Write a protein that binds this ligand. Structure first.
Ligand SMILES: O=c1ccn([C@@H]2O[C@H](COP(=O)(O)OP(=O)(O)O[C@H]3O[C@H](CO)[C@@H](O)[C@H](O)[C@H]3F)[C@@H](O)[C@H]2O)c(=O)[nH]1
Ligand SMILES: [Mn+2]
Length: 537
């Protein structure tokens, strides 16, 4: 329990009269100690109120003899949130949420989702999709491909020089991409208010037919096939549900889905709303169930192979003998000594049903305060999440996303609403953005400055700071330190063991996940550019 008001009076006793701010602290502490109710949120809020009062006294009387005790009390307050969070716990709602928006869900994604379904029959699979937006990927592809060709043609004389800086190509291509997105968006805005009430896909189809030499029948078949494939495999339509219950979040989802064509960012929004409204477990479609602990207890690992590769090899080894996922890679497993191999086959074949290989989720016991998250490379990663419906931390993350977008859009909207090309739009945005800089927000500003080229140029990673892991990391800071609207600071994986997605319940090092991580750094960028040059000729 926290120290009592009487104990604090004894500990902080001084020759000096009690300051008014000290009396307030004593009252807040006593009120926390006397709380009759068992509602976690109420306890947390009263903690917060007390912590805030202590800071007011410490800032005001910096040399006070009471500060040592009050400093200790703050440390005890930090421990209590953990205790509070860990004291009343119970199973999360039995929902597995997946999201696939913007096109046909792939067969490979369905296979991965199938593993989860087989192992966890009591959970109700929810594959969220947007019934009006099956052609967004098709459009983004068309725009990028056409732009790549335009940039190569413009730069044809230079691209052969082996010393050519491929960043001249990516910047020029971005100018063409921006012009093409802007043509689409202005066309969309001219259609969307018509009395025919067209859908996103109606408008994309028309635009592709008129400007990208496409065939309406082929696009319509692709769209209807996507709608049928998804509905047959646990699909649930965002347009027909209660995820979006305010305009602000919908506008954020729409700006990513329609203006940027950033499907991952749109999915970042949907997953939060799905957890807020329904609770359960959110998984990217490249995640796989966790391997039973004992399964490979009996297999020391060669020190030549890495801690992560060892996990990839365990998955590859399981597939090589059960074929649960068709054509699953065997590359890192084939290179092993036969006793290793023969040992793997031996333990593997020992088992009878898949539930002996992968672990069930069963009850995932969590606090209504928290959200649990996977880790990667020292950071949180929002590819796997656990949250009760309406959890306090899930709401903190949503608030972080809203505040970040409100700030982004304050500076971005005047620029994009201009009739200006990419270069001049970027200048208007940046001039506004960086005139707002402070010591607290400067890193954030620098990270969101390349927002418009996210997905199209190497090193544009603004999504992490808007809808992705950075927002979760700052919300964790908020929660742990009883703060709100943290922008400068993030908590790291080493800070968040109490919030880790339980290691035994998840396999992150799948073939599909490793396929996704191939990011847009300078190394990937050089390779894609070389292939573009290779194909152009
Ligand atoms: O065409 C598409 C492409 C992707 N999505 C959604 O985005 C999710 C993640 O995509 P993906 O794994 O390819 O990118 P990744 O770099 O790993 O995402 C991280 O960064 C992402 C953004 O912060 C984050 O969403 C993700 O969890 C991180 F791991 C995927 O499981 C879908 O829900 C889609 O619906 N349609
Ligand atoms: Mn991934």
């Amino acid at each position: 329990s926290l120290i009592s008001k009487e104990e604090l009076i004894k500990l902080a006793y001084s020759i000096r009269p009690r300051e008014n701010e000290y009396k307030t602290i004593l009252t807040n502490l006593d009120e926390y100690n006397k709380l009759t109710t068992n509602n976690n949120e109420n306890k947390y809020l009263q903690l917060k109120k007390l912590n805030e009062s202590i800071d007011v006294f410490m800032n005001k009387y910096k040399t006070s003899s009471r500060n040592r005790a009050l400093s200790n009390l703050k440390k005890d307050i930090l421990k209590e949130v953990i205790l509070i969070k860990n004291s009343n716990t119970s199973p999360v709602e039995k929902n597995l949420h997946f999201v696939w928006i913007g096109g046909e869900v792939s067969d490979i994604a369905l296979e991965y989702i199938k593993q989860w379904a087989d192992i966890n029959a009591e959970y109700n699979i929810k594959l969220w999709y947007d019934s009006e937006a099956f052609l967004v990927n098709t459009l983004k592809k068309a725009i990028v491909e056409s732009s790549t060709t335009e940039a190569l043609q413009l730069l044809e004389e230079e691209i052969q020089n082996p010393q050519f800086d491929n960043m001249k190509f990516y910047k020029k291509r971005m100018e063409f991409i921006y012009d093409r997105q802007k043509r689409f968006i202005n066309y969309y805005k001219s259609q969307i208010n018509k009395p025919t009430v067209p859908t996103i896909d109606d408008i994309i189809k028309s635009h592709l037919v008129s400007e990208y030499n496409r065939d309406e029948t082929v696009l319509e078949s692709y769209r209807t096939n996507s709608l049928r494939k998804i509905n047959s495999n646990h699909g649930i339509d965002i347009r027909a549900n209660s995820l979006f219950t305010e305009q602000e979040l919908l506008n954020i989802y729409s700006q990513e889905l329609l203006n940027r064509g950033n499907l991952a960012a749109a999915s970042d929004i949907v997953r939060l709303l799905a957890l807020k409204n329904f609770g359960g477990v959110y998984l990217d479609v490249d995640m796989l169930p966790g391997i039973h602990s004992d399964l490979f207890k009996t297999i020391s690992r060669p020190s030549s192979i890495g801690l992560d590769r060892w996990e990839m090899i365990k998955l590859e080894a399981i597939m090589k003998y059960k074929k649960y996922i068709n054509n699953y890679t065997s590359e890192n497993f084939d290179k092993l000594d036969q006793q290793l191999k023969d040992n793997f086959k031996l333990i593997i074949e020992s088992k009878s049903e898949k539930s002996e290989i992968f672990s069930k989720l069963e009850n995932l016991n969590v606090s209504d305060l928290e959200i649990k998250i996977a880790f990667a490379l020292g950071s949180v990663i929002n590819q796997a999440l656990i949250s009760k419906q309406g959890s306090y931390l899930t709401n903190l993350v949503i608030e972080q996303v809203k505040n970040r977008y409100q700030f982004l859009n304050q500076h971005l909207n005047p620029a994009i609403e201009s009739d200006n090309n990419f270069t001049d739009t970027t200048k208007i945005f940046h001039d506004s953005l960086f005139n707002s800089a402070t010591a607290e927000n400067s890193m954030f500003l620098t990270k969101i400055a390349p927002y418009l080229q996210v997905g199209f140029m190497p090193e544009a990673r603004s999504t992490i700071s808007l809808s992705g892991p950075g927002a979760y990391a700052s919300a964790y800071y908020d929660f742990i330190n009883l703060q709100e609207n943290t922008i400068e600071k993030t908590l790291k994986a080493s800070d968040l063991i109490e919030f880790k997605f339980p290691e035994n319940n998840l396999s992150q090092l799948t073939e599909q996940e490793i396929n996704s991580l191939w990011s847009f750094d300078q190394a990937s960028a050089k390779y894609q550019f070389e292939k573009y040059v290779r194909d152009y000729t």
